Design a protein around this nucleic acid. Structure first.
Ligand code: MG
Ligand code: MG
Length: 754
DNA sequence: CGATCACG
DNA sequence: AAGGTACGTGATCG
């Protein structure tokens, strides 16, 4: 009746209850369902076996687990009818307890759909789609500033400012006197945290926007709330924000709301060497943002001087986080709806996992038994499966062309699907060029069928946009057709994704083989037009007209795409991505370009990370600037020769030689003792409370042996007594950072010293 | 070398 | 207050 924003489950008297969080004509509504039961499927060697199989037992929470009910069902598997048994369980946590007991059984051929989280199982099976309708959501951006000193335990320093922003403006809560109109002064860290809780409960936002709140703002708020003995009842059910382990990093959920962390979103959507809020804001809104570094914040807080500067930075962090959230949420909301899963989960997923959620829902709709995810063995074998070289030098006036909108059409016309591949007793088939894979034409494949529907749906949205005089629906429909384009263009890549259920190596190669015929046509037609192709990948190409005027290159390129699209049948489409003033290419997905506005765009080259020393990062940025901004590779080579000589002669300040690496576990848990851990053990031995989250700063000293034995804690480094390892900083830091870039110009590691 | 570890 | 724990690249260890 309203708009679904999330779904989860609660346990009551040992039984699961599904919770559906809704927004209905401006109001928060929570619907409960007690009737949905967890299940798996089992393919048996013979029907007789069910009598033995239904009697399988497990143990969970001290008590035994049973198969509640069994049901024989007819489904489709590998494009063939299949008879399997639906095995019902009492609680979803029963599934991981009993699934291997069922799989182990001598009469069970295989088990299926045994790793689908219960709340997602519910949404699929009940045919429920989140984010449908015109329902208007409310938003709040939240940020925090902490007092930090070098290499402190996560949460030792207090939170000193909390900022938030809305359409009503950006505000700061602090516990020191600062005279600014947007600053609220409270008495303590405890009262500042309680004020944020009060702001969230009163504003009752549907969406809480953060910039990396999954790993910084919420874990820190929770750590300080713990130390202070106070609760954070931010959930609409008064629950505290909940930390979820996603990879090695975290994910924070706020119940009844959408915690929208922009950090994974922006990282997926745009290409930047660093994802600082300042770099991101400038990239999206073309406006500069000032950074106030942690050491400046500590100095201002401790001295009590220059606090206005810190409060302005805190306020801007919230204000720009609000603006970025409003910019990036509409597309995440349309992707959620398209795949039929909540924004929380979708905003945190790869495109491959978006495809899998879309396929799982469509598989239920079409009574198609879903394949299983590969085991560790199969996953590694897929990674091991096997399926031009760029022009050297510095090129000017580079035009970029995108091929990606070609592949969905190839999958559909050739019926490329795992269920149509090398079918026995097939009457008509398509044979892939060179590779020779045969795709049955007798029935539309599961994937080609879905893709066709997706593409038809996009054409209908586009037709509705041309015929619409309402700018509000035109905006919404624009996000919708874009969301379809993103999902449709992810299928080619998905066929080759090693963790995919509907993984198909032969599908991916066949699509590559058929796609190549069009790529060779584009290449030939460009070359006859005077263009030189500098780089080609399955995704696109880069070309120039050697020694031509920039507007002439653009005009001819724009005319070229207009022409090719008129020659290519159907929905096969070439796209002019952009233009670059300069660029160079090293190998596949290793290149660097500069646009006409001076913005450097690189792929697979930059080392902007804390585990690389400043000297290596500084040298790399300088080499890229000499090449792209100055068009001078000889300047770049001289930069490297000068830096290495300076390292040899001990002319580089020790602060530019520090390496930072986080401690992620108790020190005794390490299998390999890397330099940061060798340093950490020595600190612990000295009485330092070494805990996970600590970031270890070290300098590699001159000497015999591996680097771990020669690493020193930065706080212990004495320039008089210690001598850094110049050979380590030259060969393991500086030269690796620049050798890949310079290789594009004919230099070897050996050519970059005197 | 393969295993282990960390970055964003 | 559930809920399977990404992914891909590169460096140093053992
Ligand atoms: Mg959830
Ligand atoms: Mg901040």
């Amino acid at each position: 009746a309203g708009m679904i924003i999330d779904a989860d489950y609660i346990t009551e008297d040992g039984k699961p209850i599904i919770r559906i969080f809704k927004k209905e004509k401006g109001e928060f509504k929570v619907e409960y369902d007690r009737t949905f039961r967890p299940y798996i499927y089992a393919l048996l060697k013979d029907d007789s076996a069910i009598d033995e199989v239904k009697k399988i037992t497990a143990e969970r929470h001290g008590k035994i687990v049973r198969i509640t009910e069994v049901e024989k069902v007819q489904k489709k598997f590998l494009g063939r009818p299949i008879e399997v048994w639906k095995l019902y369980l009492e609680h979803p946590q029963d599934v991981p307890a009993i699934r291997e007991k069922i799989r182990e059984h001598p009469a069970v051929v295989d088990i299926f759909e045994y790793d689908i989280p219960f709340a997602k199982r519910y949404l699929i099976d009940k045919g429920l789609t989140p984010m449908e309708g015109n329902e208007e959501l409310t938003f709040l951006a939240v940020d925090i500033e902490t007092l930090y000193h070098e290499g402190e335990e996560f949460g030792k320093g207090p939170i000193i400012m909390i900022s938030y922003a809305d359409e009503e403006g950006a505000k700061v809560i602090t516990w020191k006197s600062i005279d600014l109109p947007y600053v609220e002064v409270v008495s303590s860290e405890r009262e500042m945290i309680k004020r944020l809780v009060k702001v969230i409960r009163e504003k009752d936002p549907d969406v809480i926007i953060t910039y990396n709140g999954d790993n910084f703002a919420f874990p820190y708020l929770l750590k300080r709330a713990e130390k202070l003995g106070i609760k954070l009842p931010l959930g609409r059910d008064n629950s505290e924000p909940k930390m979820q382990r996603m990879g090695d990093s975290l994910a924070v959920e706020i119940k009844g709301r959408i915690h929208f962390d922009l950090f994974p979103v922006i990282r997926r959507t745009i290409n930047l060497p660093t994802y600082t809020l300042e770099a991101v804001y400038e990239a999206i809104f073309g406006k500069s943002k000032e950074k106030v570094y942690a050491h400046e914040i500590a100095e201002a807080w401790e001295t009590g001087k220059g606090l206005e500067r810190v409060a302005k930075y805190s306020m801007e962090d919230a204000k720009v986080t609000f603006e970025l959230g409003k910019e990036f949420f509409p597309m995440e909301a349309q992707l959620a709806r398209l795949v039929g899963q909540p924004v929380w989960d979708v905003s945190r997923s790869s495109t491959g996992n978006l495809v899998e959620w879309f396929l799982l829902r469509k598989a239920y709709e079409r009574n198609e038994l879903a394949p299983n995810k590969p085991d560790e063995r199969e996953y590694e074998r897929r990674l091991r499966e096997s399926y031009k070289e760029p022009e050297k030098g510095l090129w000017e006036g580079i035009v970029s062309l995108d091929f990606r909108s070609l592949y969905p059409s190839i999958i559909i016309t050739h019926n490329v699907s795992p269920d149509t591949l090398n079918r026995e007793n097939c009457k008509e088939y398509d044979v892939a060029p060179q590779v020779g894979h045969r795709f049955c034409k007798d029935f539309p494949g599961f994937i080609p069928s879905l893709l066709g529907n997706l593409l038809e749906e996009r054409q209908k949205i586009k037709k509705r946009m041309k015929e619409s005089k309402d700018p509000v629906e035109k905006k919404l429909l624009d996000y919708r057709q874009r969301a379809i384009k993103i999902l449709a263009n992810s299928y080619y890549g998905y066929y080759g994704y090693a963790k995919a259920r509907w993984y198909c190596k032969e599908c991916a190669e066949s699509v590559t083989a058929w796609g190549r015929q069009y790529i060779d046509l584009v290449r030939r037609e460009l070359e006859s037009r005077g263009f030189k192709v500098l780089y080609i990948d399955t995704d696109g190409l880069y070309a120039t007209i050697p020694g031509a005027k920039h507007e002439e290159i653009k005009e001819k390129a724009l005319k070229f795409v207009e022409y090719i699209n008129s020659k290519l049948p159907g929905l096969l489409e070439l796209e002019y991505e952009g233009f670059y003033a300069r660029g160079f290419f090293v190998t596949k997905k290793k290149y660097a370009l500069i646009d006409e506005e001076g913005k450097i765009v690189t792929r697979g080259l930059e080392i902007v990370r804390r585990d690389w020393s400043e000297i290596a990062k500084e040298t790399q940025a300088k080499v890229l600037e000499a090449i792209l901004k100055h068009g001078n590779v000889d300047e770049a080579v001289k930069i490297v020769k000068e830096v290495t000589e300076k390292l040899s002669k001990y002319e580089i300040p020790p602060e530019k030689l520090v390496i930072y690496e986080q401690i992620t576990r108790p020190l005794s848990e390490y299998k390999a003792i890397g330099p940061h851990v060798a340093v950490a053990k020595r600190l612990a031995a000295k009485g330092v409370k070494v805990k996970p989250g600590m970031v270890i700063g070290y300098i590699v000293l001159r000497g015999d042996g591996p680097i771990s034995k020669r690493a020193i804690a930065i706080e212990e480094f004495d320039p008089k007594k210690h001598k850094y390892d110049a050979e380590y900083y030259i060969e393991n830091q500086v030269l690796p950072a620049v050798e890949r870039i310079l290789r594009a110009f004919g230099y070897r590691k050996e050519d970059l010293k005197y």
